[PDB]
Amino acid sequence: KETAAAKFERQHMDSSTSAASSSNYCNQMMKSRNLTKDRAKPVNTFVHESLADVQAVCSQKNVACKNGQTNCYQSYSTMSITDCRETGSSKYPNAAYKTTQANKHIIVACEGNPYVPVHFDASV
């Protein structure tokens, strides 16, 4: 089965591009990352930074997670991200996603050894 670190890379990492190219980016990526198979994941965020830069956030600002967990870290600088959200009219399997590109700090929960990101908590 998939490890938590590998699942985080598959669902959130997109270092091949510097930002969402078009409004079809989310439809494209949600499908090729396997996030619309048993159902469509309604919300997902992609980070357009190198994997080393995203793993480095686990040694940056330690903050509380949205669920009260204390293993979340906020990046010191902003990062290029793309928010993919299902529209009120998306019907599985024909999942329609709105793509919103932005520059913000990311907040991730880190775990294990090596200490790496395993959950995307939010962005600010």
Going by the annotation, the residues of the binding site for substrate are 7, 10, 41-45, 66, 85
| C-alpha closest to that of 81 among 106, 117, 51, 63 | 106
**What's the number of CA atoms in the CB half-sphere (13 Å) around residue 89?**
1
The strand order across the sheet containing 72-74 reads 61-63, 72-74, 106-111, 116-123
DSSP code of 93?
Answer: T
User: Considering 8, 11, 12, 33, which one is annotated as catalytic?
Assistant: 12
Amino acid at 45: T
Annotation marks residue 48 as catalytic = no
Token pair 């330690």 is found at 62
The binding site consists of 7, 10, 41-45, 66, 85
User: Considering 29, 35, 54, 119, which one is annotated as catalytic?
Assistant: 119
Annotation marks residue 105 as catalytic = no
Peptide bond connecting 93 to the previous residue in cis, omega within 30 degrees of 0? yes
- The residues assigned a catalytic role are 12, 119
